[model samples]
Target: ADINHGENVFTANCSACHAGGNNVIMPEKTLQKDALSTNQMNSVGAITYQVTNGKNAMPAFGGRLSDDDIEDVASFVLSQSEKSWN
Candidate 1:
C-alpha cells in the first residue's frame, strides 16, 4: 500500500467528494482522525471493504477499480487522516 500511489488513485477518483479528506456528501463523515474513529472507518480493512462494496450514497468502485487500487486508496486515506490532511 503505497501512500503516493494511492494519492494518484484518489485524485482521479475520490477527490471529487472527499477532497482534502473532507466529505462533501456527508458533512460529519469526513476522513479526519476523529471522524474516522467515531465512524468506525479508521482501519484499512473497513475502508477497502466500503470502497469495494459501496454503502448508501457512496458508489461502489469494485467494477472500476482493482483490489490494489482500493488498498492503496485506503492506505492513502488512513495516512492523510493521520496527517490531518495537511
Candidate 2:
C-alpha cells in the first residue's frame, strides 16, 4: 500500500478522532508507542484489526473500507507511529 494514499485516507477518515496520533475519546490510548504497546496495538496487523473491527468508541471500518484501504491506513499508522507522528 502507498503511504501517501494511506495518509490521505487517514486524514479523511481518522484525523477527526486521532489527529497527530492522539485519541480524543481516550487520551491515554494515543497511537504513541507506549500507548499502543499497552493496548496491544504496536503492529500493523493489530492496527488493521482495530480499524476493521474497532473497539469501544471506535467504529468498524470494515464495511466502509476495502481491504486495500484498511491495509493502506494500517501501513500509514505504523509509519507515522515510528516517526512519532511528526
Candidate 3:
C-alpha cells in the first residue's frame, strides 16, 4: 500500500488519539516498540484487527474506512513502530 496515503489516513483518523505514536486515552498501549510488543501488535494482521474491530477506547474503523484504507494504515503503523515513530 501507499505509505503516504497511510500517513494521511492516520493523520485524519488516528492522530487525534494517537499523535506522535502515543495513546492519549491509554498510555500503556502507545505505539512504541515496548508497548506494541507487550500488546502483541507486532504484525500487520494484528494491527489490522485492532484498527478494524477496535478495543476498549479505540474506535472501530470497519464501517468508516475502506479495506484499502485499513491495509494502508496497518502498514503505516508497522513501519512507524519499527522507526520508533521518529
What would you estimate as the lDDT of candidate 3? 0.91
Runs in model 1 with CA error above 4 Å? Answer: none
TM-score of each: 0.97, 0.96, 0.95
Clashing pairs in 1: none
* Winner by TM-score: 1
lDDT of model 3 at residue 29? 91
Candidate 1: residue 78 lDDT (0-100): 91
Estimate every model's Cα lDDT from 0 to 1.
Answer: 0.93, 0.92, 0.91
> Which window of ten consecutive residues has the lowest lDDT sum in model 2?
31-40
Candidate 3 C-alpha lDDT tens digits along 1-86: 88899999999999999999998898889988888888899888998899999898798999999999999998998899889999
lDDT of 2: 0.92
RMSD of each: 0.6, 0.7, 0.8
What's the candidate order when arranged by decreasing TM-score?
1, 2, 3
What TM-score should be assigned to candidate 3? Answer: 0.95
Error of 2 at 27 (Å): 0.5
Q: After superposition, how far is residue 50 of candidate 3 from its true place, in Å?
A: 0.8
